[PDB]
Amino acid sequence: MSRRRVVITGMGMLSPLGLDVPSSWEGILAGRSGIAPIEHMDLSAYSTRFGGSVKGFNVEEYLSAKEARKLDLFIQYGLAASFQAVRDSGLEVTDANRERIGVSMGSGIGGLTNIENNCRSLFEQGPRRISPFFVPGSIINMVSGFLSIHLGLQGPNYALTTAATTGTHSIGMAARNIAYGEADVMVAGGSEMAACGLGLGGFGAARALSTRNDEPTRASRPWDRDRDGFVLSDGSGALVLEELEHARARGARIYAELVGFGMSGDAFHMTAPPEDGAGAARCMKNALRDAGLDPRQVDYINAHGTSTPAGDIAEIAAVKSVFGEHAHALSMSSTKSMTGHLLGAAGAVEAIFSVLALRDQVAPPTINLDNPDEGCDLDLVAHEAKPRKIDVALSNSFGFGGTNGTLVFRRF
Amino acid sequence: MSRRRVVITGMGMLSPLGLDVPSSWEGILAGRSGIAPIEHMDLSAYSTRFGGSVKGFNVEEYLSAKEARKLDLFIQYGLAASFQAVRDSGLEVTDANRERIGVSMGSGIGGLTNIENNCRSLFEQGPRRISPFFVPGSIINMVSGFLSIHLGLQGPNYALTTAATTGTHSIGMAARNIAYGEADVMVAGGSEMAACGLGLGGFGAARALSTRNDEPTRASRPWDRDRDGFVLSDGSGALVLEELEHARARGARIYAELVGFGMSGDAFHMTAPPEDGAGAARCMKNALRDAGLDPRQVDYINAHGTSTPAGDIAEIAAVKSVFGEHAHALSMSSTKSMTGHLLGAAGAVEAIFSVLALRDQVAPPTINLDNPDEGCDLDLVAHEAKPRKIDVALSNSFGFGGTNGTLVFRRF
Ligand SMILES: COc1ccc(OCC(=O)Nc2c(C)n(C)n(-c3ccccc3)c2=O)cc1
Ligand SMILES: COc1ccc(OCC(=O)Nc2c(C)n(C)n(-c3ccccc3)c2=O)cc1
C-alpha cells in the first residue's frame, strides 16, 4: 500500500525518425515514415530489402572513437539514448547518491552484427582474428555496464531480454526497484540493431517480415487488410525514472508519472498469439489494477501494432475485452506504422511517445491504415495526429514466447 | 516490512558433474572434476582445448524429438533443469493458480552455437538455408517462453542476461516477485552452452581462459598462486521458489528459505574488478541487510571464485571488509574448482549447492588449492568437503560490466 511514486524526469532516443526525442516526435506528429531501402549491405538474395535505419549517427558525440570501436552498434545506440536521458534529467551524480542510481537497459538480440562479423573472421582465417573486445562489446548487459562506468552509477545494474517486450519490462522493473526502495533513480529502456544478414534472414526464413520492396514507406500497415508482417527497425529508448520526493526536492522537471506495470504469459505458442488476445487482456488488467485505475480512465493506448495478420486482430480483441464500450471512446495507435518494429527497443521508444502524448495532448497517428480489417472499428487515429484530452496513456508490448508487458502513465 | 516469505520447494540441474541434482552434488562432495578435453569439435587452432561439458544428455527425456530440434542446446538445458525442478516441487498447475506461476530463466550468451551454425549456412549458401526456427529457437527468453507453454504458466514471464551474474539475479528477482505479491510460485535460474568456436575463441582472444591443456582437471584453481583464468563450462540450474504459506498449505517439502537478495555495480571497468572488491562488499552488505542478518550469522559462502588473478583476490578483500574477524570463522569455497565457470548458469547451480550445504550440513571443497596466494588465508575448504554447522549460506556472482549479485539462504 505504501510504496513510493515514480515519475519520468528525462528521456532520450535514436530512431528511424531522428537522432533525439524532439526530432523523432516531430516525425511522428507529422505522419513521417522512417522506412527505406537498407543502404549499408547488399540484400540481392533476401526477400526483404528495407527497414528503419538510424541515419547520420555520430557516436563521437557521446564517446571517444577509442571507446566506441570496442562496442557493437546496439551498445552505442543504448549509450546515446541513456546519455541523452541523463542530460535531459539534469541529475547530478555524487558520492551521496551514486549507490541509489541504477541502470536497466535491455536488448532482444544484442550484438548480432558483431557476432556475424566475427564469424566471418573465424571461418575465413581461424580464431586468431577474433577481437579481444568481442565478448564485452557484444553481450546485452554491457549498455548497463558501460553507462554505470561512464557516470559512476553503483545502484542495481541489470539487463532484461524479453524479445519485443524488452523495453517495456526494463522500464517496469526499474520502476518497481524505485517504488520498493532499492534505488531512487533508474536509467531504463532498450536498444537494438539487428539489421544484418542473420536478422533479416532470420525473420525472413520464419516468413514474418513485410516483403513490400516496391513501397517501403507503405509496408508497415497495422490493422490494414493488406498487411503482410512487420518491418525491422533499429534504435534505442531510455527514460530516467525517479522517486517523486527525490525529483521535487531537487526541482526536477517531471514529464509524467509511471503509475502501473503489468506482465503476463499467453502460454499458447512460441510466436503466434491467441486469437482472442487473452494474455494481452490479463496483462492490461494487471497494469490498470497496479495503477488503481478503472479501464474507463484510459484516454490513449500506444499499441504493439506490429503489422502482422494474427497480432493486430488479437490486440483489438484484447482491448475490446478489457475496455468494453469504452473501447470506442479512447484512441489507440501504432507508431510502428512510422517507426517500424524496433524489437527490444520498441517498448522504450513507445514509452516515450506515450509520455509525449500526455505532454502535448495529442494522439499520434496510425499511418497506412487505408482499409481497416474486419473488427478494426476502434478509433485507430488513421492517417493524422488527433489533438485530444489525454490524462492516462497505456503502452503495450507482446513478444515471442508469449511474454506480455503493459505500462500505465498519468499526467502528473 | 510486511512482505511475504520465499522458500525453495524444488531444484533441478545439468552440470559437468551430472544430469541431475543428486549426481552433481555427489561429484561435488567427492571433490570430482567435470573438466575434460572437448569431444564435440576440432580445437587444433585454439589456445584452450578443454572445458566442462554436459555428458550423455538425452533431450528426449524431457521433450519430443520434434520439439527439441527447434531449440538451441542452451534452451534444451534450461528446459531440462526447469522440468526437473517443477517435478521435484510436486506442484500441480491448475486454472485456479496458473496466473500465479511465473518463470525467470536467463542466459549470458544464449544461442551462440545456433548463431554460428546458421552463419556457416549464410556465408556458404546465402540466406535461404537459415532455419525458420532460428530466431525463436536461439533467443534468451525462449527458456521462459517454452516452459510457460509446456506447463501452462501464465504469471510473470521474463529473462535476465547479466553475464556471470545471470543465475543469481534471475533467482533474486523471482523471489522479489513472490515477496511483493505478483506471483506465488516462480521457476528461476539460468542456462548456458557457449562451447563453440565463438565462445572459446571469444574468451581466448581476451586471454581470460586457463590454457592448462596438459592437466584439464587442475586448470580451475581458485585462490591458487598458479591460477591462470577460468574454465568454460555448460549447463543449467533451476529452482522452484514459492510463498511460504502456499508451500505449507499444500504440504510441500521445503529445502530452505531465501531471506536475502542484493545487487550493486562496481562502476569500475568492463571486465576487471576493483582490487578491494568494493562493489562485491556493498552487494553482500545489501543482501545481509535485506535478510535482516548480521555478518556474524553467515556460516558458508559459495564464492564466485573463477580462478582469475584479480577476481579471486578481490573476493577475499570484499569478504574481509564485510565480515572482519568473522572472516576466519566461516567457510568459503569455490565449486568452480570442480564445475568450471557455467557463465549465466553459474549462480543457478551455485544457488543449489548452497541450499544442499544447508540440507547436508557440509561445506563443499575448493579442489586444486595447492598453494593459496598472498592474502588467501581464510577457511577456503581446500581439497575435501568439511562437515560443519551451517544455518546461513551466501552465494556470490560478479560479472562483466561490474554487475554484482548475492543470495542469502537460511535453514527453515
Ligand atoms: C495482442 O496480441 C498480440 C499482438 C501482437 C503480437 O506480436 C508479437 C511480436 O512482436 N512478436 C515479436 C516479433 C514479431 N519480433 C520480431 N520479436 C522479437 C523481438 C526481439 C528479439 C526477438 C524477437 C517479437 O517478440 C503478439 C500478441
Ligand atoms: C570480488 O571481485 C570479483 C571476483 C571475480 C569476478 O569475476 C567476474 C566474472 O565472472 N566475469 C565474467 C567472466 C570471467 N565471464 C566469462 N563472464 C560472462 C558470463 C556470461 C556471458 C558473458 C560473460 C563474466 O561475467 C569479478 C569480481
- Would the CB atoms of A145 and B401 count as touching at under 8 Å? yes
Sign of the C-alpha dihedral computed for residues B109, B113, B118 and B121 taken in this order: positive
A170 touches chain B (CB under 8 A): no
Q: Which of A74, A398, A403, A404 to mutate to test the pocket of ligand 1 (most atoms within 8 A of CB)?
A: A398
Q: How far apart are the first and last CA of chain A?
A: 20
Closest Cα in chain B to A163: B141
**Residue from B122, B131, B81 nearest B104 by CA:** B81
Minimum distance, in Å, between the CA of residue B145 and any CA atom of chain A: 4
Extract the C-alpha cell encoding A288: 490498470
User: Whole-angstrom Cα distance, residue B185 to residue B24?
Assistant: 25
DSSP 8-class letter at A323: H
Which residues touch B35 (CB under 8 Å, ≥6 apart)? B16, B50, B51, B52, B216, B217, B219, B220, B231, B233, B340
Which residue ranges have their beta carbon within 6 Å of ligand 1?
A 108-109, 163-164, 203, 208, 230, 273, 277, 280, 304, 306, 311, 314-315, 318, 341, 343-344, 398-400; B 135, 139
Collapsed DSSP state (helix, strand, coil) of residue B192: strand
- Nearest atom in ligand 2 to the alpha carbon of residue B273 is 27
Interfacial B residues in 185-224 facing A (CB < 8 Å): 197-198, 200-208
C-alpha span between A6 and A186 (Å, rounded): 10
Which alpha helices (H) appear in A69-165, and where do they start and end? 73-89, 112-125, 142-151
Give residue for cell 528446459. B79
Nearest by CB to residue B149, choosing from A99, A180, A268, is A268
Q: What's the start-to-end Cα distance of chain B, in Å?
A: 20
Helix (H, G, I), strand (E, B) or coil at B362: strand
CA of B170 to the centre of ligand 1 (A): 22
CA dihedral B386→B8→B280→A237, nearest 10 degrees, is: 160
Q: Solving technique for this entry?
A: X-ray
Alpha-helix residue ranges (DSSP H) falling in A219-277: 244-249
Q: Where in chain A is the domain with CATH 3.40.47.10?
A: 7-249, 260-410
Cβ separation A98–B267 shorter than 8 A? yes
User: Any chain B CB within 8 A of the CB of A153?
Assistant: yes
Q: Percent helix, strand, coil in chain A (nearest 5)?
A: 40, 20, 40
CA torsion sign for B130, B135, B139, B145 is: negative
In chain B, which segments carry CATH 3.40.47.10?
A: 7-249, 262-410
CA angle A357, A401, B397 (to 5 degrees): 95
Cα distance between residue B287 and residue B292, in whole Å:
9
CATH topology of domain A260-410: Peroxisomal Thiolase; Chain A, domain 1 (3.40.47)
- Dihedral over Cα of A349, A350, A356, A362: its sign: positive
Q: What is the C-alpha to C-alpha distance for residues A302 and A321, in angstroms, rounded to an integer? A: 17
Q: Torsion-angle region of residue B241: left (phi > 0), alpha (psi -120 to 50) or beta? A: beta
Report how far residue B186's alpha carbon sits from residue B86's, in angstroms, rounded to the nearest whole number. Answer: 10
The verdict on the CB of residue B162 being under 6 Å from ligand 2 is: no
Q: Which residue of A has its CA nearest to B154?
A: A265
Nearest to B396 by CA among B273, B290, B287: B287
Kindly report the length of chain B: 412
Angle between helices A309-323 and A278-291 (to 10 degrees): 40
Least Cα distance to A363 among A29, A12, A31 occurs for A29
- Give the atom of ligand 2 at the shortest distance from the alpha carbon of A135: 22
**What gap in Å lies between CA B400 and CA B162, rounded to an integer?**
8
Q: Which ligand is nearest to the CA of A317?
A: 1
Residue B190's φ and ψ, nearest 5 degrees, are: -160, 170
* Cell numbers representing residue B258 in the block: 531465501
Question: Which residues does chain A have within 8 Å of residue B282's beta carbon, measured at their own beta carbons?
Answer: 99, 154
The architecture CATH gives domain A7-249: 3-Layer(aba) Sandwich (3.40)
Rg of chain A over all Cα atoms, to the nearest angstrom: 20
B263: chain A residues, CB-CB within 8 Å: 102, 155-158, 182
Report the residue of A79, A160, A176 to disrupt the B interface, i.e. the one with the largest count of B CBs within 10 Å: A160
B102–A180: do the CB atoms touch at under 8 Å?
no
CATH 3.30.1490.20 fits B262-410, yes or no: no
